Every structure is written in C-alpha cells, then in structure tokens.
Design a protein around this ligand. Sequence first.
Ligand SMILES: [Mg+2]
Ligand SMILES: [Zn+2]
Lengths: 226, 237, 26, 82, 625, 49, 63, 674
Amino acid sequence: MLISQRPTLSEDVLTDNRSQFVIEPLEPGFGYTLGNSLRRTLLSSIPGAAVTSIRIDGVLHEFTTVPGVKEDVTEIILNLKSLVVSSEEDEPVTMYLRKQGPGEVTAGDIVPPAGVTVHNPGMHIATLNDKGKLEVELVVERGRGYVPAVQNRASGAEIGRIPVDSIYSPVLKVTYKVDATRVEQRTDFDKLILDVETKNSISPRDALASAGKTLVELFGLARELN
Amino acid sequence: MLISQRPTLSEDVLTDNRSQFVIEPLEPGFGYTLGNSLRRTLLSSIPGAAVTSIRIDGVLHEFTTVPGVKEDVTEIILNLKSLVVSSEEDEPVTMYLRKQGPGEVTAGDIVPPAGVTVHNPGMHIATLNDKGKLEVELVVERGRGYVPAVQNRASGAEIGRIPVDSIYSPVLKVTYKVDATRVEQRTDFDKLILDVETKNSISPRDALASAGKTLVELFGLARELNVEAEGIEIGPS
Amino acid sequence: NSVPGAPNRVSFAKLREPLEVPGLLD
Amino acid sequence: GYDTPLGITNPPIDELLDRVSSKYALVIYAAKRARQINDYYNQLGEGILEYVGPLVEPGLQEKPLSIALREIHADLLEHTEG
Amino acid sequence: HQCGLPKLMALELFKPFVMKRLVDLNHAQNIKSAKRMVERQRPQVWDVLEEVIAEHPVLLNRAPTLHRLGIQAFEPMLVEGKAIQLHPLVCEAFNADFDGDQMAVHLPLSAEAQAEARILMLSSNNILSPASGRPLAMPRLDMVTGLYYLTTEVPGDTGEYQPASGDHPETGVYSSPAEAIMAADRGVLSVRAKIKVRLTQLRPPVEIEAELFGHSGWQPGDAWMAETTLGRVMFNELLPLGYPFVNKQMHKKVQAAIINDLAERYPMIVVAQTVDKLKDAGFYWATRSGVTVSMADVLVPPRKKEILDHYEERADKVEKQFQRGALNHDERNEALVEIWKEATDEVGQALREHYPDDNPIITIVDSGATGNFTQTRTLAGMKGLVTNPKGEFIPRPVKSSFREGLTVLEYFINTHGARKGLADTALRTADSGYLTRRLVDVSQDVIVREHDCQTERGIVVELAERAPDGTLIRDPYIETSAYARTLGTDAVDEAGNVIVERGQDLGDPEIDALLAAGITQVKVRSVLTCATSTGVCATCYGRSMATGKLVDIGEAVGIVAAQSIGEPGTQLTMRDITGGLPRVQELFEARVPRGKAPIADVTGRVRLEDGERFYKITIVPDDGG
Amino acid sequence: LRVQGPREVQIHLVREVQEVYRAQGVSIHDKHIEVIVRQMLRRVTIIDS
Amino acid sequence: WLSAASFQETTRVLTDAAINCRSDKLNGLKENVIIGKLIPAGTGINRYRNIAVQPTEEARAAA
Amino acid sequence: SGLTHKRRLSALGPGGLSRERAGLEVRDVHPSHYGRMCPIETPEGPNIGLIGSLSVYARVNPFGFIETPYRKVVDGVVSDEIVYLTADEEDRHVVAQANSPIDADGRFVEPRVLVRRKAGEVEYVPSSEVDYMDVSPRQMVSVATAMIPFLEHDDANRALMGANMQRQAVPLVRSEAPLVGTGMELRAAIDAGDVVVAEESGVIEEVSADYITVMHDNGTRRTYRMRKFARSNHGTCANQCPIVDAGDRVEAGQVIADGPCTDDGEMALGKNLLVAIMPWEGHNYEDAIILSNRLVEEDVLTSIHIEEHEIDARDTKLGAEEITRDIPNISDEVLADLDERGIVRIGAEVRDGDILVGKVTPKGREVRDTSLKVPHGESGKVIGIRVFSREDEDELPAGVNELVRVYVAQKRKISDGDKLAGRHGNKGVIGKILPVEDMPFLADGTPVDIILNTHGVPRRMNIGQILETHLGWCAHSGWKVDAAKGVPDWAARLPDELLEAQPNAIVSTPVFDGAQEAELQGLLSCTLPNRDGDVLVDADGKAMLFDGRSGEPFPYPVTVGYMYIMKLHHLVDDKIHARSTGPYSMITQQPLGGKAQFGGQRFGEMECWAMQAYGAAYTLQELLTIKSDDTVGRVKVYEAIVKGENIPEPGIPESFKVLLKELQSLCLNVEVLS
RNA sequence: CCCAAAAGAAGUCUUUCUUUUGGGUUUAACCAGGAU
Ligand SMILES: [Mg+2]
Ligand SMILES: [Zn+2]
C-alpha cells in the first residue's frame, strides 16, 4: 500500500507581498504538523534589517520637544518604528533626513546610502509649520527576531544618542489549511495550503527558503546519528 | 547568521528496545518546532509490514467460537494482529498456519514463503484439545502508518476472509517533553526529551535516523526554491 | 452630543433625558 | 515504587525514618554528622583529629548535610538518644 | 518541591556563599575582589550562583500565617523576571490566589536550620491537613475539570464498541493501549468512547482478579481484557503500579478518596509523585475540554413567564386580603414571602431540568470544580428574595436574572444586602485572630512527654447506635469522634472472643469489623483522662492526623489544636441565641449564655403554671426532699 | 458541671462546639477541642481551708 | 509572670508579681522565645538535643 | 482619580465618627440614598461605608442637605417641570421609575408601575397617584460607576471592584478610546480639567508641540501653553498634545488638546485587546493572565514614570555649605558626568550608584560629603534640573542657599507581576508573556493577544464582560442589518443609523438603558467579512482556534472578542526587594523596615507559632538571635560563612536587656538569678 | 565587623602587605492613603 509519489510544492502569487504554497501529497495526519512547523520557523527566525538608534539635532534626551514639529520627540520615535528597511551590509550604516520649511516630512525624504533602500516612501514622520528644522541621523543594522533597547551606557555612546528598539522581522502574517481526503478504500493523503504575507522587505519565496534552510540544518543534526 | 551554541544528541538506553533521546540547548523557540514534527515522522513514516486479513476454516457465518479450539474468534484475531512480520514483496503474499492434534500452536509453526519472516517465533496463538485441528490463511503486505480494517471491496470474491486492522509502523509509542537548561545570563533555553519504543524489527536509533532522513527530504524540497538564501546555521559536527 | 467637536459615538439608548448633566465640579 | 527521586528529595524520607524513632532524632543526627564532616574538610590540610569521613564517595560539590543523609541511608552510622 | 526565584533576588540572598565560592575557584584573589565582582555582576557569578543554591532549602511564607502549613520550605531554582513562581498544588495550603498577593522568602543558615528545612518543613512532606487529616495537595479547579472530562463515557461516540452483526466480526476491540492511542491520533477513535482493550500493565479490579487469576495476583505481565474508555486507561496509567484499576467518572469526591487511600497505604514520596502526574494530566486536558462561557451558553428556562404569572396571582390575592383587613401587616409579609419562595424553587427546578448534561456551566458546577447551583440559578433563572438592612426579606421580590439585566430598583435593593457581606467579612476576619491568639496562649504547655501512661480511664464513643427495627445505621459524624483513637478496653460481642485488642489504632478496617460483629459502644483513651503529671502521653493522644502514625514524643500538640480550632474562622459566618463565632467565643470563655435555659436538678414530674407575663415551673422530687 | 460532674461538662462543651462547626460544613477532629477543654478544667476551688 | 505579662493586662500582672516577689522558673515556650533559648519542645528536648553520632567500627576499619 | 477625589464625601474627621469606632448600622445603604450617594463606589478596606461619592445629578442646597431633581407629573401627564427635592419631600410624595413606558405624549402605557413609597417600600400603584418621576436612569450611580458598560448585568460586589479599579490606571505612552463606552467619557474628561478647552471661538494661527495660537474673531489673540512631561503627585507623566491643525476653526468649549489619559476628548484608560476565554495549560490558573508578546514589541502597554530628588544646602550655625563639584576622596571616572557647577548634565543615564549633586557641610577638610546619590533601585535619563539660589533673591527656606532638585524618568514596559484588569472587576496578574508564535490564532492567522480563564466568570457573577466581549467584536468587524424586505423584528426599536456600521466603529451603551440580549444576537448574526469572504465568528459568538504550540485545531469552538483592559499601578518593580546585610536600628539593634533604607521582612508574631508547631527549634532560635539583634553573632556568622567554618552559637537578644532596663526604670528590682 | 584617603615595599602595567587619620546608622514618632 506504499504510495508511489514523493511530495511536491507549487506556488501561486496572489500579489506582490502575499503568496500561497501548495504541498501535496502528504501522509494522513502529517499536514497540520508540517504547516505549524513552517509557521513557527517563519515568524521568529528570519533575518532582516531595522533601525537601531537615531540622533536628532536639538535633543539631548528623548523626552523633549524639537522646535517647530507638531509632535513630540517620542512620537517621532514611534512613527519611525514602522519603517521597512532592507540593508545588505553586515556592519552599521548611516542615513540622513534633512528638511527645512513649512510642510510635511515623510520617510521618502530620507536619503539612503548605497545598499539600504527605504521601501515604503510616504508613511508619515512629522509636520513642520514655519520655524522648524529636522536634521536626523539613523543607523540601520541587520539582525533577527527582537532586540530590546541597546543600553546607551553598556555600549559606549555619546550623550545625544537615542537607542531605539529593533524588530528585524520581514514576515507579517502566516496561516494554513488542510484538504483531507478520507476515502472508503483507505488510500488517504493531505494537501497543505500555506499562505504567507511579508512586509514588502522580501518576497515570500525568500522567507520560505530561509525557513527551509534552518529546518534542514536542525533535522540534519537529527539525522547524523549513525 | 550563526546559532552560537550547537545542539547535541545523546541517548539513554533503558531496555533492549526502548530509548530516551535528549536534545540539549536549542534556541528558545525550537523546543516544540522539531518535537512534534519528529514525533509524527517517527510514528507515521517508517515502512513496515503487518497482517491485512485472515480466513479460518469452519467460521463463515457465526464468529463467536471456532470448533475444536479453546479461544473465541476475537482472541485469535487480536493475537494475530500483534505479529511482527517483515516483508519485501510489494504484492500481498499468502501464508498458511495449520496444526492437528491437541497441543499449543506457536508463531513458529507458520511456514513462510520466500521473503517473509517472523521476528518473534515463540508467540502463543491458540490451544487445541481433543484431536482438534486449526488451519488459518493469512495475507501479508507492507504498508505505512496505521490503517484501520478495510471492508470487503468485492464480497462475492471471498466469504471466509475477514479484514483486520494493520499496524504497519514498527514504532509503537512515542512521547516528548521540554524543559529549561542554561545559566549564562539567559535561563530560557529548551531541552527536548523523546521516548521511543519499538517492536523487535528496528532499534530506536535506526527509527530516529530514518525519520531524520524523511524530514530532511521534505524541508529540502521546501528550501529548493532559493539555494543562496540566508538562514540560521549550526556549523560543523 | 452638545460639545462642538466631540467624536461621533452612536448610542443604543431608547429613552431621552430632559436634563443635561450638571457641572461635575460645581 | 519511587520512580527516580532527584535533588533535595533524594533519598526518600520514609527509608530514613526507618532508621530512627522519629523525624526529630533524624534532624539532629544528620546535623551533627554534617558539622563533623565540615570540620574535617576545614582541617583536612591541618593536623589529624578524631573526626573522619566522608564514609561514602564525595560528589563534585555535594554540600555537607546531603552527604550525611546519604550515609544514614546506607546504615553506616549509629546513634544514642539522651 | 521546587520554587522559582528571580535571579536578582537570589544573587542577593546568597551573597556570602557566592563570595566564598568565587574566592575558592581563584576567580578573585581575596574577599574584597569577590565582593566587587558580585556587586558589579560579572558574567561568571551566575555560573557559580547556580552551583551554590543547589539543594539549599528556602522558606516561603505568606501573611497572615493562620495555620501550621503557612510556612513551607522549597528548593529554589532560578527563573527570568521579577516574580516568585509558586507551585499550583499548594495554593490551597497558603490560601493564596494570584490577584496580586505577595510572599516573603527567608533563608536558613546553620546546619541544623537546613536539616529542619529538609525533613520537617519540606513541601512534599505535608500533604495532609493537620486539623482533620484530609489531603490539601489535591487537584482543584482546572485540574478537576480536565480529569472529569477525561474519564467520562459518552454514549454513541466515534469508534464505539459494536457487537457482531453476523456479517463482520466485533468492532472496537484493540490489542493494547498503544494501538488505541495510535488510532485516536488518526481521528477514528474518541478518548471518551467505550471500547475493549487487552491490558497488560494495569492491575485488574478485585472481582476480576479473583475470578480470573486467583492464585496470588496478576503478576505484571499477564494480560486481561477490560471494557472501558481510552481516557480511563490513560488516567489509571498515572496511579502507582500496584493500585487496582479504577473504572469510574472522577468526580472530585472520588479523587479525594483515591488520594486518601494512597496516603494511607503508601509512603509519602509516591503520593507526591502521583499528585504531580495528576496535575500534569489535568492541566493538559482542561484545555481541550472546551469549557467556555458565551451568552448563547446561558440558556433561560422555557416557561418562566407562566410560573411567574401563576405566583403573581397568589400574591395579588394575598394583597387584596390584606386590604380588606383579613390580616395584619406581618401576616401579609409572611404570606408573600412563602409564595415567592415557592416560585423561586419552581423556577430553579425548571432551570435544572432544561440544561443538557454537557453545558460548560453545569459541567463546571457538577464536576466539583467550583461553585454551586444557587449561583447558576441567580445567573440564568431568577434571583429571588433579597434582604433589608435589618435582615427581613423584601416582599417585592427581585424577578430578573443577571443575564436579562436587573432594573434600577431591583439593583438598589440588591446592593442593600450586598454591602453587609463585605462589612461582616472584614469584621469577622478581624475577630478570628483574637480567638486564635487566646486559644494559643491557653494551650501552649500541652506537650507529649511520655510514651504510655498505662492508665485505664477513658471515654465512651457513640459509634452507630442501633436502629429501632434492628439494624446498625452508622453514625454520620464518626470520622471526627471514633477514628484515630486507641482502645482502652477490649471489644467483646455476644460472648465471642475479643474482636479488637487493647491498644489498637482503630482505623477503617477495625471500625468495619466492629460494626460487622454488632457492637455499638466502645471505650477509647483520650487526653481528657491522661495521667501524666505534665503534658499528655503518646497513646492517649493517639494517631497524629498529619503524619498518619502514632504521634512523636516531642510534638507540640497544644499549638496545633489552637491553630486548627481557629483557622476555619473566616468561613464560619458571624450570623437572641448566638449561632456563629460569638457562640464559640462565649463557649470557650465559659460565660453565662445570652439567653439562659434553666435545666432540671432532680428527677420526677414537673408542675407548670402559665402565669401572666412569665411562666412558672416547679420540679416535684421523687425523693421528696 | 455542678450538677452532673466533670464528664458531663466535657461532653457538653465538645458537642456544642462541634455542632457550631458542623453546621457550616467544617470538619475538625475532636481531640483538639478535647485538648482545650482539658486545659480549661485544670484547677479546683477551696471551700474549707 | 513573664508569659502572663506578655499576654494581657501587663500593668496588673507586673504589679502583683512585684508585690508577691514571684520567681519565674524558665519553662514553657514563650519565655524561651523571649530570652533567645531553645524551646523545650520539638527538636529542642533533651532526648534529641544530646544525640551522639559516631561512625561504625566496620567503616572505621575500612576507612 | 482627581475628578472622583473632588466629589468625595467622607464621614470621618474632626467632629465625626472614627474608623475604629463605627458600628454596622452606619456602613449600610439607607433607602434614602437613592440619587444622592452612589451605593456602588466605595473603598473595599476597613473604610467600607464611611467614604462615598456624590451622584451625578445631586446638588447641595444652602443649608447643606443634598437635593436631587425630579420631573413632576400632573394628572398622569409627564411634564418637563424639574423640581429639586430633598430627602423629606421625597419621603412625603410618591415617585415612579425613569425607564417606564412613556407613550410619546407623557402618559404611562399601563396603570401599574413600580414606585417608591415613604419608607423605601417598592410597590405597584396605579398611574393616577404618581406625583414625580426620575429625570432619567443612571441617577443613582456616581461618575466612576457610570462608565462601566452593561452595569446592570454585574453583581454589586464586582461592580464595586470595577469602580475602584478605574482610579488606579496609569497614563500610557499612547492612548486609545474604547470601542464600547457609555457616553459618559466625554463629560468626565472635559470637566476633570486635564484637557485644554478653547476659551473663545476663533481660527488657529500656529500649532506646535509647545503652544497653540488662537486668533479670536475680533482682533485679540491668545496663546495656550502645554505641559510637557510634568511629574504628577504619584509619579506619572502629564503630557498634552494638540489635536488641531493650522487651518481649522474652533468653537467655544471645544476640546483643543488631549491630556494624560484622553483621546480626542474622551477618557481612554487602557487598550482594546483581542481576548479568548479558554483555559490554557494552567498558566492562567486562579485569576492569572497570559499576554502575547505583541504587547511588548509594539509598546501597546508602556508607561512612563518620573522621580524627583531634592537636596538643600543648609546655612547651619557653622555656615559655608556649598554645592561644589570636587568630591573629597573621589575617583575621576565617577566625577565625569557632573557639570562645572556639580549637577549632572541633562541627558545622562544615572543608574544606581552615581552622583547627582556634590554637597559638603562643615564637620563642626572639616566637611562631610552628603552628595545626594541615586537611591537603591532607580535608573533612567535625567530630563530636568531646577536650581534655586539665594543670590538670585528667591524665596528659599530660612537658613539655606540652594535647593537643587533633579528629575529622573524611565519607560517601564509590561512584564511578569503587573496587575492588568478589565472594567467589570476581572483583576489578574500577568502570568507568562508567551512569544507571538505559540498563541491560539484564528483561521486567518491573527493571534489572540490575551487569554482569560473560564472558571472565573460564572462563579463571581460578572457575566457583563462576556456580553461586552461580544459587542466589542461587533464594533470591530462592523455589521449591516439587511433591511431588504422590512426590518427584522429584533431590530424594530433599534435606532436609525445603527443598522449599519463601518469597521472600527465606536458605540455607547448607557449604564442602565443599553443593548438588550436580542439586539446582540441580531448583530452577531450579521457581520462583515474581514478581507476575503470569510466570517471568523459564527452566530453563537465563538470561533475555531488553531493551537500554535502543537499545530492541531482545538476540538471545540471558543469565545473571541475585543475587550478594553487597562494597566494598574501596582507594578512589580516597586515591590521586589531583598536584603543580605544592611543598616540596623539605633535604640534596639534590629534591622530597619521598608524598601527605602534597605529593609528586612518582619517575622511576625503568628509566624513564630508555625515554627513552634512544626517542632523546629534551631531555625526559630537562629531567626531570632543571630539574624536580628545579637551584636557579636552577626559578625561571627558572616566571618564563618565567608571562611567556610561552621556557624557559631547564639548569645542573647539586645531587646531583652532593653526590657530589663525599662523595668528597672519603673522601680522594679528585676534580677537574673542563677 | 566594614569603607574612604595619604605614604612605603613587591610584582603585574594594577593586585597584595605595612603605618597614620577619618569614620557606620537614610534613625525616630505621628497623621494620611493603599494591598491581600
Ligand atoms: Mg488575592
Ligand atoms: Zn494518659
């Protein structure tokens, strides 16, 4: 009764930042588990890039008010935490945002060096009325998972440095379903349909590939017993 | 990227065929990610063989008792069910177990054709009294996992044949747990603890290796999309 | 309600209250 | 049918209470033996004294009291009440 | 026997020990360098810290420490965060909920102080409440619901056993619990479906063992057929190996009986391990039981309106009778109270009838996890009568259930009685401490000093007085007057030999044998008659309730009694004859009761004259003096 | 106590306290209350010097 | 008089004890707690407080 | 908290009863309180009943008696003539109920209606004797209790803990208005006075994080200044930010700037979190709670706290006290932060063990360096210094020259030991913040962000929350009653423009006249799909959850919804405390008490009975001799421990010798015979 | 018992030994507000 097929995987592209992968035919009962394993690896262990610390002109600490911005400096930090950066360098880089005059200030104004590239120009950073100037310096860096604020004293730093929490997670939302076929003759199989959605930093194929590599490494650890 | 602490695999043999593998520090999310998958792979991906159905002479309509035999039908059925048999021919082969005269039948009394073998010859099956005779035909084929009894596809083909459940997988029971193991400024790592129990056909070590191979194949199929993609690495052995 | 720029918060109320709430610090 | 006691629960208390009249006697028994062992450890490099031990193989760092209890279980010590 | 400790607290409590070990391992030349290391928290201190606390007991305490088990010694293990982690099976002993309670940690230092924190005060050595002997480390709340869901037999479920139909053999017969679990993992079998398995690692019940094996026992390895649910096999796989097979639905009373029997017949370590495994299974299964609360699960009785109108008619007639002068105010109030009480009972009965047997609310209530049926009636059917500030019932009464929502007036008259509950709770929890203090101070010098006074005095115990027609109806309150004593005389019945010898623990088998023999009264020893000059003897006191064996020769029984007669002081309500905590106080204080009752002085007949404004009684002496 | 002797008052006190505790469904073994009652009845009063 | 004084009516107990010149033999559990000495119950009683532990002769020979 | 503190009535004080001398006849709720003193809101401790809150509509008449409004009925016609009555007049007449069937012409539908007679009796009187009616429901509930949705479904006992746990929230970094309120938020916010309200109508000229300029209609101009990161009396931030742009027009009384806990002018004490009602692996056992990690990464619950440190350079008789930089006998590194004057530069993280001020006073060099240091357990940046100088002719205390004062601020995230709690009284302490991957997630991949136990709801009778949960979901997903062929019967009395709502629509259910059960069932029956044509919550209100930790779906559906939960001010970081060896008292040599100095826990009176009962004597002896007040025992045990020796024997306690001296002072010849 | 400063000696490029001076109670009592 040994099935004569080996599992195969195919992709369907719903849009730029979403996809559905179909894996079939799996053994009965082995659909939910595989889907959950891929989901767990996707949502916690994908490397990405994010902003680590920022420096603004007239602010020693981070509980102050830059002159000419409607929001505070903490609000600017919260609004700068939604950026979607994608760096290629393994050492700290630097970015500069410069504005002067009435109008809005968006992420799009940010001038990235070679490599990093802001992927969602236009979100919202802050509004400048007439007499405000914003000259801010950002530090993009690679990483994985989550990393609380890198304390300023612990890691040698100046007084005008503002550490910021980092979130190096490209995967936004993952789910799955299984189409079980329980026939009367007991020739059974599942069919895993796994839906991936990333935040425009990396295409879903790459996230799935990274999860595959990590799981292959661990289960290869498992294999090399004899 | 780098994992910064390699995992390890050690085994604590308990019985002749029963082990308890320990996989020490894993990153603090992978205690379950590979536990449940490995459990399921062990239980339902290792090929084996088992008895699919049998026919016993003299029992066509009434399935309560067999004339000339001490035990009722169900006892014989569930004694034959837990019979460890290894096969290579993919087609279903047939075996005959026959004995006359009073005594005690044993699994070693069966005459297997080429290829099929029995790994526990000394198993009690039935007892005969008062010049009794037993003659039962078994059909054996190799499967995977646990397949409940399959009802007749063609009733007219055979009347004495009665299907039975098939325990194809050579692994019987498996369980797993997780704990915390570190004092290095982070007491939140995971330690996986398996408990594999197997028939007398495959030692738990080989079962774990075979499960590893299958999972590697599946997730390699997954990885094949972009070979040069960045992901965690454990390094060399 | 009666505050010039309050958010539009819809209510399930069936009855009508003739008297507005007095000044809470009065 | 104890499975495999681990840590502060090993050895089982019942087998220890088997050795004495009441848990109260066992307390002082173990405490005095632990004090003797500790004095031996502090004096091991110095001149010899009557205090001996441990009668069992010492562990990596097994704290004195534990060893004392392990000895009471093996029946290698004797005591007399007031 | 483990408790979590946040490593920042552990680094501080164990400072000197950490410094010593740092110096020994040559990580610091002298004590001052080690002190600086510990103050600055270099990465290596942790590595030594874990090695220092190993097998070093730590005392946990909570305030108030009402009874003996308020202070318990655990073994510490490091955890992440800033909160002491506590084992869930001791919450009853401490009486600690997790709504913001705080607990204190102390450390013993000397060799004796550590020994007394491993043999006397370890957590796993106190499983039986000293007051009454009932277990306190028993599963409760979520665990009970999980186990009750596990060991249930729901008819007509998936994979149920089906007798032979004449065309196919029996279905639902499995050759081992491993195969049953393998099938359950595939969805073909349900954990609560009746099946027949072939067990070989569980000891069969008494009757099956006698009628199948005989000889001596099942001798693990011999196989027997059992008709049960896979869930019950899973549960019986947690209990010790030698325990018979328990095939029952695990209502909380049954679990209490099982744990009590285990404690009686086994050492304490096995009981500890068994309760741990039961906790694990209960928690794992309570998640899958599907016990959720949604307003679609709070069903309302189908015919509340009919009943309410029917009794409203009676109330209307009573009111009209009052208006016509047929009765005074109090009579009307009493009649309305009776009518509405009947209406409440009828609505409650209909509500009890309507609910199915698997509703989450009634599953929680009936399984002994928590709550009683009165609260379910209040939630779904009807609240019923409510109280005035004085205490008399309001004759309205409330008529709406909390699901439908009360109106304004009904809510007001509800708060009326709601507030006094909190007020009395505060004042009674204040009072109880005073009584506990006085009791501790009166009975602080009663200590077991000798092993046996060798007296012959003793008290007599009622012990299941005989029935009128002829039968031995067991006295209901025997677990608190005849168990755990020592007989002073011998028991002889109908000229038969001595049934129980002098000086016996008098446990369940002995009491059963005595009742079977057919004797109703026995004379037992008691501290009231102990003959030692100072303190009670050991045999007179008898079995120690917590240990399960004869009390020791140093125990301080006085303080144990003082705490046990004063710990259940909050539960006892504060409700002209006193009948609550004031009654206990005026009993122990030996005050003249509030309303005295003159008792007789000498036998004979009594002459009563019903004078005006007060009775007059006279006792006619048979002697005639 | 003055009428029926010490045994009667002992049984009386024990029964009353146990009734109060039982009415609320609390189980207390009698030996504790007997200990306290033992402590209450220790002294005697002198009538003739 | 120490225990009674620590229980209730401190003034009355102290004054009457002073008048009668009572000498308090130190026995009980509250006074021994007050003066920081081992309680005469539990592990503190003489029978268990003067135990003498000593290795067996066989172990002494084996060393 | 402020608004409720100003409207408080306390019966204890100079000329009133005392906390320890009040009977149970003054703490009850007399039937005359209806409409004059809320019966729900009251402290839970030993003050229960002695402190209360004035109701919403009450006023105080010239003599000081509390009055309430009533709408008078003439000849069975409900007019609008509002008459204020005191207790006596209300006693004399007969009063009806607010939520009675008015027939749109001021006439009762049926003759019989509940009323309140003289002595608080509730009875049925025909609709011809009625003399007055309540102006509206809610008239009996104070401001705090009027903000609980579905109040009439909760027992009084839990509504009390619900009304005493809205005065202990903490202003979060970013606030959010609740999805399901009770229409009372706006008035409470505007009256509490923490928001800025345009005093006169005009057009906004310039807006900035510091100030707002309003150009009134007739020439004049006004500038409103904003409080940025100002400490409150209990250590919580007091931010204010504008909500108007440079071109908008404002009207008199309009809200122009948010406050600490306000969102567009509405009270916002907490956050809307996705909640499931299943028990999970025992982590949420006995009232505990479980959070997802998404509430830590995204600062959904993240408070700001500010601490104040003061120091005064007293003149003293000797004189010459000065706040100087150079600290005698100090290292160069530890003096690095200090500025030229000797005050930490604003913008430096002063963790425990640093200097904030350099102070030296004469010894009577001959000086003592009382350099104010960060006390034990604080950290965070230094956001503001304020130095007052005598030379600048300030109003300093007599006999000083300087009063330098420093502020240190820190952001606390959520963590184990906190005390989240809903509104209805479902308090709990966060039990385990699981990672975002192993959480029960709905069919479309959304992970639930909190988990509550089922065993706590039915027993305590606060079913209200479950109803709220359902309604919350209906508010989030948005519904549309299909009036294709006549409105469905269950929605006949549902008001217009409520048959349909957009996603994230806010609704209000007044306290005692709200959403009936039938209306909730109808709303739940129809709800829009989320993104694709899927409905995640079926009619009963329960969804099908996937178990993230194992993979398999939970066998039975579970309740899911949106609940508004807060963060209480009982954080763990202010509670944890430990002591090995530290300061000791002076009169008696026992250690001090309290987290400030160093503090050691108290081994109280009835924690020496448990030790006696166990039979442990040595532990008690050491807990009372060589750990508390035996002067030589302490040093000897410390030396033995560090050097590995066996701990020494105890002596006698110092307090005993103090007792002997006190007795001897009274002319009692106490002697220790032998 | 413990810490700080100054000087001398040895080695390490920063720890140990010797001498002098200075030192240690953020105490305490009230009122108020909270927690279980
Ligand atoms: Mg609590
Ligand atoms: Zn005796």
